[PDB]
């Protein structure tokens, strides 16, 4: 059924054994082997889009390794010329299905690092991610990022984060910032996001562990105005008795309920659960 709240899951589908996330060792980074992996990941991207259209999922997060090692100085070919046509085609499918596409670079992507080498590698990775979403024609695509490390002093870490991203026209087309469970709350992310002119993704588990002064309801209410399009939110549940913020297999009914009650209006909810497409109902 057609709900005002659209759902998604990241990277892979467990029912199908489909993934967008195959990689390889850099010792095996041959033109032929990468083309191998990329092809299977693109095949799987397509199956997933089709499975989502038949099973009520409007959102999908494409894993970083879709084109394995694309941002790496040893990448064996022009991936954009190789794939532009097929990405446009997959992009048109996703739009025909009404699907919204996203990527979330890992915890080692840190534009606010003071190490210039980490900055350059991080920027390379975000530029590849943004180019991919551009080639898929993802008009409302999202590229989600945590604010990363305090590196001893937050004011300076944030100023580096903004300086190192303000110039990046293409990345800024898609970039949205997300609160975390340890270092940067929603009030903090809203400040960073305004400086950069980008939206805020509220994560409900992270919010719970690290709320600042804000009830979830006010967090969502402040975040909603930061999206020109449909706001995106993350939904996870605590994996019982494990490390705080560890993701449960399936989201609880109680946690789903609490978000539904807090949302100020229509939004897109990425379910971050170890079960993937089995993470809710």
Which segments are annotated as binding site for Mn(2+)? 104, 146, 178, 203, 206, 234, 247, 272
Which residue in 12, 44, 178, 255 binds Mn ion (CB under 5 A)? 178
Closest distance of CB 73 from Mn ion, Å: 27
Q: Which does 191 bind (CB under 5 to 8 A by kind): Na ion, Mn ion, none?
A: none
For position 37 contacting Mn ion by CB under 5 A, the verdict is: no
Residue 157, token pair as written in the block? 């870490």
**With respect to Mn ion, which residue has the nearer C-beta, 37 or 65?**
65
Judged by CB under 5 A, which stretch of 7-15, 81-89, 183-191, 227-235 contacts Mn ion?
Answer: 227-235
Which residue in 44, 203, 255, 268 binds Mn ion (CB under 5 A)? 203
Q: Which residues are annotated as a binding site?
A: 104, 146, 178, 203, 206, 234, 247, 272
> What torsion, rounded to 10 degrees, do the Cα atoms 123, 41, 104, 141 define?
90
Which residue in 150, 258, 264, 275 binds Na ion (CB under 5 A)? 258
Partner residues linked to 5 by β-bridges: 267
Q: Which does 255 bind (CB under 5 to 8 A by kind): Mn ion, Na ion, none?
A: none
Residue 45, token pair as written in the block? 């991207």
Interface mask toward Na ion for 208-247; x: CB under 5 A: ----------------------------------------
Judged by CB under 5 A, which stretch of 34-42, 64-72, 84-92, 202-210 contacts Mn ion?
Answer: 202-210
d(CA 280, CA 272): 10
Residues forming the site for Na ion (CB under 5 A)? 257-258, 261
Residues forming the site for Mn ion (CB under 5 A)? 178, 203, 234
């Amino acid at each position: 059924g057609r709900h005002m709240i659209r759902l998604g899951y990241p990277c892979e589908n467990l029912t199908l054994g489909a993934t967008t996330n195959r990689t390889l060792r850099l010792a095996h980074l041959t033109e032929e082997r990468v083309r191998e992996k990329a092809a299977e990941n693109l095949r799987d991207l397509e199956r997933i889009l089709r499975f989502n259209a038949d099973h009520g999922f409007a959102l999908f997060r494409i894993g970083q390794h879709l084109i394995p090692f694309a941002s790496h100085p040893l990448f064996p070919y022009d991936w954009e010329g190789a794939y532009e046509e097929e990405l446009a085609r997959l992009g048109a499918l996703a739009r025909a299905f009404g699907q919204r596409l996203s990527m979330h670079p890992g915890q080692y992507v840190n534009p606010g690092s003071p190490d210039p080498e980490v900055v350059e590698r991080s920027l390379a990775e975000l530029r590849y991610s943004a180019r991919l979403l551009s080639l898929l024609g993802a008009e409302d695509g999202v590229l989600v990022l945590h604010l990363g490390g305090a590196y001893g002093e937050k004011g300076k870490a944030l100023r580096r984060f903004v300086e190192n991203l303000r110039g990046e026209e293409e990345v800024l087309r898609y970039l949205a910032l997300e609160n975390d469970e340890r270092l940067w709350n929603v009030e903090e992310v809203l400040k960073a996001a305004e400086a950069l002119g980008v939206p805020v993704v509220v994560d409900t588990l992270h919010h719970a562990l690290n709320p600042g002064r804000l009830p979830l309801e006010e967090a969502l209410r402040l975040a909603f105005p930061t999206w020109r399009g449909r706001p995106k939110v993350h939904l996870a549940s605590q994996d019982p008795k494990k490390r705080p913020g560890a993701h449960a297999f399936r989201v609880t009914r109680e946690d789903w309920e609490r978000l539904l009650s807090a949302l100020p209006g229509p939004a897109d909810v990425m379910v971050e659960a170890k079960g993937k497409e089995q993470g809710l109902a």
